[PDB]
Amino acid sequence: KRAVITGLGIVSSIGNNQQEVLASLREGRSGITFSQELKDSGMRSHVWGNVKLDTTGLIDRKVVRFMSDASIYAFLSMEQAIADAGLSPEAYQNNPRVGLIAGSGGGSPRFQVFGADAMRGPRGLKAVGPYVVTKAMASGVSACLATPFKIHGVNYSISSACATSAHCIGNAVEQIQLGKQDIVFAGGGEELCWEMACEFDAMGALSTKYNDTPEKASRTYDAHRDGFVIAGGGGMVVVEELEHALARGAHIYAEIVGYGATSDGADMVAPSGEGAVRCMKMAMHGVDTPIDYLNSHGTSTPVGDVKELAAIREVFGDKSPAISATKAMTGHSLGAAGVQEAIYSLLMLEHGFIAPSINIEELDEQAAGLNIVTETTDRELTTVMSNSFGFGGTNATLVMRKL
Amino acid sequence: KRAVITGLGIVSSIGNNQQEVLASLREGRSGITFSQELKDSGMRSHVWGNVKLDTTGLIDRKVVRFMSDASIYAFLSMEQAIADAGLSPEAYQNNPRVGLIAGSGGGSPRFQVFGADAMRGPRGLKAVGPYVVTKAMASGVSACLATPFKIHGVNYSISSACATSAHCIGNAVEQIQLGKQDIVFAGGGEELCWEMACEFDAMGALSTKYNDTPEKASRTYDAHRDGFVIAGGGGMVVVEELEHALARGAHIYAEIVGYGATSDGADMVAPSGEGAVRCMKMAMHGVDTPIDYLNSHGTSTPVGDVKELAAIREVFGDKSPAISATKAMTGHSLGAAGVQEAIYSLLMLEHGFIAPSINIEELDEQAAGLNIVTETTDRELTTVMSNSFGFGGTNATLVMRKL
Ligand SMILES: C=C/C(C)=C/[C@@]1(C)SC(=O)C(C)=C1O
Ligand SMILES: C=C/C(C)=C/[C@@]1(C)SC(=O)C(C)=C1O
Ligand SMILES: [Cl-]
Ligand SMILES: [Cl-]
C-alpha cells in the first residue's frame, strides 16, 4: 500500500499555522528572539525559537490539565491537520483503522523537575498533584492526543532525540504499508525551557556568540557558526493510505515514496556521516525521479553541518539537489524538527518554491560543489527529501513526491 | 516473513540473569523490599522492586558516561541476549540488517532533576557537565546501546508508558515482516528513583498500606490490593527473521505469532477494557492454537486488575486460559515491564511451567471462575499471551508460540 499526506498542522517559531509559516519561509524571516528566561537561568546561550502564541483557553480545561507544552503544541497542530484534511469527527474518531504516532525528544524536563521540586517542599505529594506523570512521561505527546481525539488504532510515541518526529512519520507509513491502518496522525511536539536548554548549553551545543543579534545566531553553513539555537513547537501530518484518500476526495500534498532509518553505531554526540549516506540511499531506493530539493538537518553546528554535506556529496556526486537549512530561520525544535521540516518541505512542494538558507555571510568551504540556495527561489518541484539525525547516531530521511 | 525470539537477557527485581529469574519464578519469590530512599523523600509508598546488582565497573567508562540506569539495565540485558543467542560481533556489528528498538517509560527524571538542581547552584553549567542530555533524554535506552554495539540498522525507542517495551518488541516484529531487518534487538529499561516514583504516588497509584510487609504489598487480584509497587530493571530479546535463524542453527524459544496494538481513546489514567479486547483479538487473528497461559498486565490496582479480567472474559468466552500476574512477585517496572514479562512468559514456555500469582489472600469477586494460578505448576505449554497497557489508553499484546 502507498501512503500520502492529506493534511498538515504546525505551531512554530516562524508561524502559528501553515499560512504564517509559508509567508515566513518565502521572506526568509527569522523566528529567533532574545530569551530573558535563558539568560536568568545562568546559560551562555540567550536566544531561542519561541512559539509566539497565547495558548490560554485553546484546549478544554479537563483535557489540558494532563498536558505539558509539547503536548499542547502537538494538539493544536493536530486540530489544524484534521481541519486541513477535511476530516469530520465521524471520519476519524472511535475508528480502529485510525491511529496516532507522535513524540517528543525531551518529553517534559520542566514537569520532571516540577515534580521533584514540589515533592521537596512543604506540601509534598499535594504540590505534585495528580497530573505530573502524563506531563513528564516520555509518551506524553501521544497519550495526551490519542485520548481526547478518541483514537482507536495505534497509539504510541517514537523517541529518537532530534530525529523523533521523522521516525514517527516513517512508522506511520509502515502502518499503512502493512495494511494495519488507513490513517495515522504523525508528528510531535517540544517544550521550550531552560530546564532542558541548559543541558545542551552545558555540552557546548548551543550558540553563545550572537546573543546581541538573535536573528543572526542560527547560521547553518556559515564559517562562524557556533552551535544550534534551541526552539520549541509542534507539527502533525495526516498520513493516509492512497486508495482511502482518493475515495473520499482528499486533497493530497504528496506521496511518501521513501523512508530511511539507520544507525551510525559509532559516536554518541557526533555523526559518522556514513549512517546518513546509508539513510539517504535507503530512502531513495526505487524512487525513479531526481531529488529536486533537500531540507537538510543543518543545525548550525561546526562538525555536524559539514558531516552532513559530505554525506550529501557522497550520495548525489555532482548532481546535488537544491539544499537549504531552514533551521537558520527557525532554530532547532529537537523532537519536533522532523515533522516541522517535512511540513516546510511539503509547503515548498505545494507552492513551488525553495526556501532560503539564511545567514550565510561566508559559506563554509565544504559547501563547494553543492547547490546551497540562499535566496527564495520560485521553481516547480516534484520530489523533495528531508533529513533528521539525533544523538545516539539515529538517522531518518523522508522523500515526498507529487502524485 | 516470520519472526522468532532467539536470545534473551534480563536484569530484574527477581534476578540478574535468566537462571536467577527462572529460579525465582518457580519459587514464587518476591523481589520487593523496603526502600529507605522512598520513605526519606516523603512518599507514602515505601516499597519497591529494586535491582540487586552492583553495576559498578560492568560497562566501559567511555560508554557508561552517557548512560542513566535505564540504559545500564538495558545494556547488561543486551549483553546477556547476545551471548544467549550465540551471536558474534562479526555477525551483528556494522550490519545494516541488524537493528535496535528499545525504550523507557520515563527516560531519566533522576538526571533531569540533577541537571536542573546543578544549574540552579553557584556553578551553573559547570556543575551540570556535558553528559546530562544523553542521560536525561527520552531515547537514552536506544541511543546508548545502538552506539557501543555498533548497530547499523534501525535505531530508536518506542515510548508508550507502561506498554513501552511490548510495543518495542512488536515494532521489531514489523521490521522483520517488512523485510527490512534480519535481527532487531528489542526491549527496554527503567530506572528506580524517588524523583519518578513520587509522580505516581501523587496520583494515588502506588501501594501504601503494606510498607511493614514489603513482600505482601504487590497483590494482583487480592480484594485488598491498593496500587502497584514500582520497580526498575531491563530486558532485551533478539527478534530474528525465521530463515535467518534456522540458517545459523539458532536456538529458537518461540515465534511471535501475534502482535496487537490499539488505543482506548477514552480516559487518561483508567482503562476502557474495550481497547484491550480489540488488542487481544488483534493478536489472536490467524493464531490457530489456544492460549495455554496468559501473563496479565495485572498491576495490583483496584480498577485496572478487574477491567483487564473483564476484557479477557470477553475475548475468550467459555474457554478462558490459565492466568498469572507476575507483578505480584516483581513489582511494576513501567516501560521495562513488557519485555521482562515476555521473558518470564518465554521461560515458562521453554521450561514448561506456570509461575504463580502470589499474595492472593482473598480473591476479588470479579476474578471468580478464572484459572488464576496461585502455585507453581509444571505444564507443557505451546502458545502464551502477554498483555501490557499504559496511561493514555495505549494497549499492546504479544502472542508467542513454540515452533
Ligand atoms: C550522533 C550525533 C549527531 C547526529 C549529532 C547532530 C548533528 S544531530 C543534532 O540535532 C545535533 C544538534 C547534532 O549535533
Ligand atoms: C489508560 C490507563 C491504564 C491502561 C492504566 C493501567 C491499568 S496500565 C498501568 O500500568 C497501570 C498502573 C494502570 O493503572
Ligand atoms: Cl501561493
Ligand atoms: Cl529445567
PDB file of N, CA, C and O in Angstrom, chain A residues 167-214:
ATOM      1  N   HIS A 167      10.984   9.814  12.434  1.00  0.00           N
ATOM      2  CA  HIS A 167      10.673   8.379  12.590  1.00  0.00           C
ATOM      3  C   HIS A 167       9.173   8.179  12.864  1.00  0.00           C
ATOM      4  O   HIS A 167       8.614   7.152  12.466  1.00  0.00           O
ATOM      5  N   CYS A 168       8.513   9.132  13.548  1.00  0.00           N
ATOM      6  CA  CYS A 168       7.052   8.958  13.766  1.00  0.00           C
ATOM      7  C   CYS A 168       6.342   8.888  12.418  1.00  0.00           C
ATOM      8  O   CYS A 168       5.497   8.031  12.188  1.00  0.00           O
ATOM      9  N   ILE A 169       6.729   9.797  11.513  1.00  0.00           N
ATOM     10  CA  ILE A 169       6.101   9.803  10.176  1.00  0.00           C
ATOM     11  C   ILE A 169       6.424   8.507   9.417  1.00  0.00           C
ATOM     12  O   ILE A 169       5.530   7.880   8.844  1.00  0.00           O
ATOM     13  N   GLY A 170       7.696   8.083   9.453  1.00  0.00           N
ATOM     14  CA  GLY A 170       8.071   6.836   8.765  1.00  0.00           C
ATOM     15  C   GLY A 170       7.327   5.612   9.325  1.00  0.00           C
ATOM     16  O   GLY A 170       6.888   4.733   8.583  1.00  0.00           O
ATOM     17  N   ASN A 171       7.162   5.568  10.652  1.00  0.00           N
ATOM     18  CA  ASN A 171       6.469   4.446  11.273  1.00  0.00           C
ATOM     19  C   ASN A 171       4.976   4.460  10.881  1.00  0.00           C
ATOM     20  O   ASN A 171       4.358   3.409  10.728  1.00  0.00           O
ATOM     21  N   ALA A 172       4.398   5.664  10.781  1.00  0.00           N
ATOM     22  CA  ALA A 172       3.022   5.817  10.288  1.00  0.00           C
ATOM     23  C   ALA A 172       2.913   5.238   8.878  1.00  0.00           C
ATOM     24  O   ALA A 172       2.011   4.491   8.582  1.00  0.00           O
ATOM     25  N   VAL A 173       3.855   5.575   8.013  1.00  0.00           N
ATOM     26  CA  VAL A 173       3.923   4.979   6.660  1.00  0.00           C
ATOM     27  C   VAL A 173       3.967   3.448   6.716  1.00  0.00           C
ATOM     28  O   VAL A 173       3.263   2.747   5.959  1.00  0.00           O
ATOM     29  N   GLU A 174       4.785   2.899   7.610  1.00  0.00           N
ATOM     30  CA  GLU A 174       4.843   1.433   7.758  1.00  0.00           C
ATOM     31  C   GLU A 174       3.493   0.820   8.149  1.00  0.00           C
ATOM     32  O   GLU A 174       3.143  -0.271   7.654  1.00  0.00           O
ATOM     33  N   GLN A 175       2.730   1.516   9.005  1.00  0.00           N
ATOM     34  CA  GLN A 175       1.422   1.005   9.402  1.00  0.00           C
ATOM     35  C   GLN A 175       0.512   0.949   8.185  1.00  0.00           C
ATOM     36  O   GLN A 175      -0.295   0.019   8.064  1.00  0.00           O
ATOM     37  N   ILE A 176       0.619   1.953   7.323  1.00  0.00           N
ATOM     38  CA  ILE A 176      -0.190   1.965   6.071  1.00  0.00           C
ATOM     39  C   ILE A 176       0.286   0.820   5.167  1.00  0.00           C
ATOM     40  O   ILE A 176      -0.528   0.038   4.666  1.00  0.00           O
ATOM     41  N   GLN A 177       1.609   0.695   4.995  1.00  0.00           N
ATOM     42  CA  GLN A 177       2.195  -0.371   4.144  1.00  0.00           C
ATOM     43  C   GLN A 177       1.806  -1.776   4.583  1.00  0.00           C
ATOM     44  O   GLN A 177       1.599  -2.674   3.751  1.00  0.00           O
ATOM     45  N   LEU A 178       1.697  -1.994   5.893  1.00  0.00           N
ATOM     46  CA  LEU A 178       1.352  -3.315   6.437  1.00  0.00           C
ATOM     47  C   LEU A 178      -0.163  -3.569   6.366  1.00  0.00           C
ATOM     48  O   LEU A 178      -0.617  -4.640   6.774  1.00  0.00           O
ATOM     49  N   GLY A 179      -0.911  -2.549   5.936  1.00  0.00           N
ATOM     50  CA  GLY A 179      -2.373  -2.606   5.787  1.00  0.00           C
ATOM     51  C   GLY A 179      -3.091  -2.554   7.127  1.00  0.00           C
ATOM     52  O   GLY A 179      -4.294  -2.838   7.221  1.00  0.00           O
ATOM     53  N   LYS A 180      -2.367  -2.125   8.164  1.00  0.00           N
ATOM     54  CA  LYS A 180      -2.927  -2.125   9.533  1.00  0.00           C
ATOM     55  C   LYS A 180      -3.798  -0.913   9.836  1.00  0.00           C
ATOM     56  O   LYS A 180      -4.689  -1.002  10.670  1.00  0.00           O
ATOM     57  N   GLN A 181      -3.520   0.227   9.198  1.00  0.00           N
ATOM     58  CA  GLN A 181      -4.240   1.463   9.445  1.00  0.00           C
ATOM     59  C   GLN A 181      -4.534   2.126   8.107  1.00  0.00           C
ATOM     60  O   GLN A 181      -3.719   2.027   7.165  1.00  0.00           O
ATOM     61  N   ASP A 182      -5.630   2.884   8.073  1.00  0.00           N
ATOM     62  CA  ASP A 182      -5.948   3.711   6.912  1.00  0.00           C
ATOM     63  C   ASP A 182      -5.466   5.159   7.080  1.00  0.00           C
ATOM     64  O   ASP A 182      -5.156   5.852   6.083  1.00  0.00           O
ATOM     65  N   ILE A 183      -5.453   5.640   8.341  1.00  0.00           N
ATOM     66  CA  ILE A 183      -4.962   6.972   8.636  1.00  0.00           C
ATOM     67  C   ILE A 183      -4.122   6.847   9.871  1.00  0.00           C
ATOM     68  O   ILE A 183      -4.532   6.163  10.809  1.00  0.00           O
ATOM     69  N   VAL A 184      -2.975   7.538   9.871  1.00  0.00           N
ATOM     70  CA  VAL A 184      -2.209   7.692  11.120  1.00  0.00           C
ATOM     71  C   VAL A 184      -1.804   9.138  11.224  1.00  0.00           C
ATOM     72  O   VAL A 184      -1.194   9.682  10.302  1.00  0.00           O
ATOM     73  N   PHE A 185      -2.151   9.791  12.329  1.00  0.00           N
ATOM     74  CA  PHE A 185      -1.688  11.150  12.561  1.00  0.00           C
ATOM     75  C   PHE A 185      -0.266  11.039  13.089  1.00  0.00           C
ATOM     76  O   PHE A 185      -0.039  10.294  14.029  1.00  0.00           O
ATOM     77  N   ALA A 186       0.679  11.748  12.464  1.00  0.00           N
ATOM     78  CA  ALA A 186       2.090  11.573  12.816  1.00  0.00           C
ATOM     79  C   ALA A 186       2.753  12.915  13.020  1.00  0.00           C
ATOM     80  O   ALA A 186       2.529  13.842  12.248  1.00  0.00           O
ATOM     81  N   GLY A 187       3.574  13.011  14.040  1.00  0.00           N
ATOM     82  CA  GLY A 187       4.281  14.251  14.287  1.00  0.00           C
ATOM     83  C   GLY A 187       4.926  14.291  15.655  1.00  0.00           C
ATOM     84  O   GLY A 187       5.497  13.319  16.152  1.00  0.00           O
ATOM     85  N   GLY A 188       4.848  15.454  16.278  1.00  0.00           N
ATOM     86  CA  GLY A 188       5.480  15.584  17.579  1.00  0.00           C
ATOM     87  C   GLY A 188       5.412  17.012  18.113  1.00  0.00           C
ATOM     88  O   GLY A 188       4.815  17.924  17.508  1.00  0.00           O
ATOM     89  N   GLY A 189       5.971  17.181  19.309  1.00  0.00           N
ATOM     90  CA  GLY A 189       5.990  18.490  19.965  1.00  0.00           C
ATOM     91  C   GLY A 189       7.209  18.566  20.858  1.00  0.00           C
ATOM     92  O   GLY A 189       7.801  17.545  21.209  1.00  0.00           O
ATOM     93  N   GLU A 190       7.585  19.782  21.220  1.00  0.00           N
ATOM     94  CA  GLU A 190       8.756  20.005  22.086  1.00  0.00           C
ATOM     95  C   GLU A 190       8.524  21.285  22.862  1.00  0.00           C
ATOM     96  O   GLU A 190       8.195  22.329  22.285  1.00  0.00           O
ATOM     97  N   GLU A 191       8.674  21.200  24.178  1.00  0.00           N
ATOM     98  CA  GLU A 191       8.581  22.415  25.004  1.00  0.00           C
ATOM     99  C   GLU A 191       9.877  23.224  24.895  1.00  0.00           C
ATOM    100  O   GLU A 191      10.943  22.684  24.524  1.00  0.00           O
ATOM    101  N   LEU A 192       9.779  24.493  25.276  1.00  0.00           N
ATOM    102  CA  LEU A 192      10.949  25.351  25.298  1.00  0.00           C
ATOM    103  C   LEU A 192      11.163  25.806  26.726  1.00  0.00           C
ATOM    104  O   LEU A 192      10.267  26.353  27.336  1.00  0.00           O
ATOM    105  N   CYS A 193      12.332  25.520  27.292  1.00  0.00           N
ATOM    106  CA  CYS A 193      12.524  25.716  28.734  1.00  0.00           C
ATOM    107  C   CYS A 193      13.989  25.665  29.076  1.00  0.00           C
ATOM    108  O   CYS A 193      14.736  24.865  28.541  1.00  0.00           O
ATOM    109  N   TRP A 194      14.389  26.472  30.052  1.00  0.00           N
ATOM    110  CA  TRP A 194      15.775  26.439  30.491  1.00  0.00           C
ATOM    111  C   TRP A 194      16.179  25.055  31.049  1.00  0.00           C
ATOM    112  O   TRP A 194      17.340  24.660  30.980  1.00  0.00           O
ATOM    113  N   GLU A 195      15.204  24.372  31.656  1.00  0.00           N
ATOM    114  CA  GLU A 195      15.454  23.062  32.278  1.00  0.00           C
ATOM    115  C   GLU A 195      16.151  22.113  31.304  1.00  0.00           C
ATOM    116  O   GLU A 195      17.097  21.418  31.673  1.00  0.00           O
ATOM    117  N   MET A 196      15.654  22.107  30.070  1.00  0.00           N
ATOM    118  CA  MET A 196      16.226  21.269  29.014  1.00  0.00           C
ATOM    119  C   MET A 196      17.361  22.000  28.287  1.00  0.00           C
ATOM    120  O   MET A 196      18.416  21.398  27.998  1.00  0.00           O
ATOM    121  N   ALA A 197      17.133  23.273  27.953  1.00  0.00           N
ATOM    122  CA  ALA A 197      18.143  24.018  27.175  1.00  0.00           C
ATOM    123  C   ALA A 197      19.495  24.044  27.869  1.00  0.00           C
ATOM    124  O   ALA A 197      20.539  23.927  27.219  1.00  0.00           O
ATOM    125  N   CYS A 198      19.505  24.170  29.200  1.00  0.00           N
ATOM    126  CA  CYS A 198      20.785  24.265  29.912  1.00  0.00           C
ATOM    127  C   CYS A 198      21.670  23.008  29.759  1.00  0.00           C
ATOM    128  O   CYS A 198      22.913  23.102  29.860  1.00  0.00           O
ATOM    129  N   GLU A 199      21.061  21.839  29.528  1.00  0.00           N
ATOM    130  CA  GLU A 199      21.833  20.599  29.384  1.00  0.00           C
ATOM    131  C   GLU A 199      22.616  20.624  28.040  1.00  0.00           C
ATOM    132  O   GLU A 199      23.755  20.159  27.965  1.00  0.00           O
ATOM    133  N   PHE A 200      21.985  21.183  27.018  1.00  0.00           N
ATOM    134  CA  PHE A 200      22.645  21.382  25.704  1.00  0.00           C
ATOM    135  C   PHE A 200      23.744  22.430  25.782  1.00  0.00           C
ATOM    136  O   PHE A 200      24.796  22.262  25.206  1.00  0.00           O
ATOM    137  N   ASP A 201      23.483  23.524  26.509  1.00  0.00           N
ATOM    138  CA  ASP A 201      24.483  24.556  26.704  1.00  0.00           C
ATOM    139  C   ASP A 201      25.674  23.994  27.463  1.00  0.00           C
ATOM    140  O   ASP A 201      26.837  24.296  27.112  1.00  0.00           O
ATOM    141  N   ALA A 202      25.394  23.141  28.453  1.00  0.00           N
ATOM    142  CA  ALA A 202      26.440  22.555  29.272  1.00  0.00           C
ATOM    143  C   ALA A 202      27.395  21.625  28.477  1.00  0.00           C
ATOM    144  O   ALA A 202      28.544  21.391  28.889  1.00  0.00           O
ATOM    145  N   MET A 203      26.914  21.105  27.341  1.00  0.00           N
ATOM    146  CA  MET A 203      27.802  20.319  26.450  1.00  0.00           C
ATOM    147  C   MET A 203      28.376  21.171  25.304  1.00  0.00           C
ATOM    148  O   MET A 203      29.072  20.657  24.429  1.00  0.00           O
ATOM    149  N   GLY A 204      28.090  22.466  25.305  1.00  0.00           N
ATOM    150  CA  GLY A 204      28.656  23.393  24.309  1.00  0.00           C
ATOM    151  C   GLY A 204      27.931  23.349  22.969  1.00  0.00           C
ATOM    152  O   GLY A 204      28.433  23.863  21.958  1.00  0.00           O
ATOM    153  N   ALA A 205      26.722  22.788  22.958  1.00  0.00           N
ATOM    154  CA  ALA A 205      25.994  22.586  21.707  1.00  0.00           C
ATOM    155  C   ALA A 205      25.279  23.810  21.151  1.00  0.00           C
ATOM    156  O   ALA A 205      24.898  23.825  19.978  1.00  0.00           O
ATOM    157  N   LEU A 206      25.039  24.807  22.016  1.00  0.00           N
ATOM    158  CA  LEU A 206      24.202  25.932  21.630  1.00  0.00           C
ATOM    159  C   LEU A 206      25.035  27.139  21.265  1.00  0.00           C
ATOM    160  O   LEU A 206      26.114  27.342  21.810  1.00  0.00           O
ATOM    161  N   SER A 207      24.459  27.952  20.413  1.00  0.00           N
ATOM    162  CA  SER A 207      25.089  29.229  20.014  1.00  0.00           C
ATOM    163  C   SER A 207      25.199  30.187  21.217  1.00  0.00           C
ATOM    164  O   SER A 207      24.246  30.338  21.997  1.00  0.00           O
ATOM    165  N   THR A 208      26.348  30.854  21.354  1.00  0.00           N
ATOM    166  CA  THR A 208      26.528  31.762  22.506  1.00  0.00           C
ATOM    167  C   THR A 208      27.125  33.108  22.118  1.00  0.00           C
ATOM    168  O   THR A 208      27.176  34.018  22.960  1.00  0.00           O
ATOM    169  N   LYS A 209      27.548  33.242  20.857  1.00  0.00           N
ATOM    170  CA  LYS A 209      28.324  34.429  20.453  1.00  0.00           C
ATOM    171  C   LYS A 209      27.513  35.567  19.844  1.00  0.00           C
ATOM    172  O   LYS A 209      28.057  36.655  19.605  1.00  0.00           O
ATOM    173  N   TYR A 210      26.220  35.330  19.630  1.00  0.00           N
ATOM    174  CA  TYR A 210      25.343  36.167  18.864  1.00  0.00           C
ATOM    175  C   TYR A 210      24.094  36.607  19.639  1.00  0.00           C
ATOM    176  O   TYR A 210      23.068  36.984  19.048  1.00  0.00           O
ATOM    177  N   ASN A 211      24.183  36.579  20.970  1.00  0.00           N
ATOM    178  CA  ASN A 211      23.018  36.952  21.812  1.00  0.00           C
ATOM    179  C   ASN A 211      22.482  38.378  21.539  1.00  0.00           C
ATOM    180  O   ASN A 211      21.289  38.652  21.696  1.00  0.00           O
ATOM    181  N   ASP A 212      23.396  39.270  21.125  1.00  0.00           N
ATOM    182  CA  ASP A 212      23.061  40.672  20.872  1.00  0.00           C
ATOM    183  C   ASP A 212      22.328  40.847  19.545  1.00  0.00           C
ATOM    184  O   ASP A 212      21.695  41.872  19.308  1.00  0.00           O
ATOM    185  N   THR A 213      22.421  39.837  18.671  1.00  0.00           N
ATOM    186  CA  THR A 213      21.770  39.859  17.364  1.00  0.00           C
ATOM    187  C   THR A 213      21.099  38.506  17.162  1.00  0.00           C
ATOM    188  O   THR A 213      21.572  37.682  16.368  1.00  0.00           O
ATOM    189  N   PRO A 214      20.019  38.258  17.903  1.00  0.00           N
ATOM    190  CA  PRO A 214      19.451  36.896  17.960  1.00  0.00           C
ATOM    191  C   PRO A 214      19.114  36.318  16.580  1.00  0.00           C
ATOM    192  O   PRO A 214      19.227  35.098  16.374  1.00  0.00           O
TER     193      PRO A 214
END
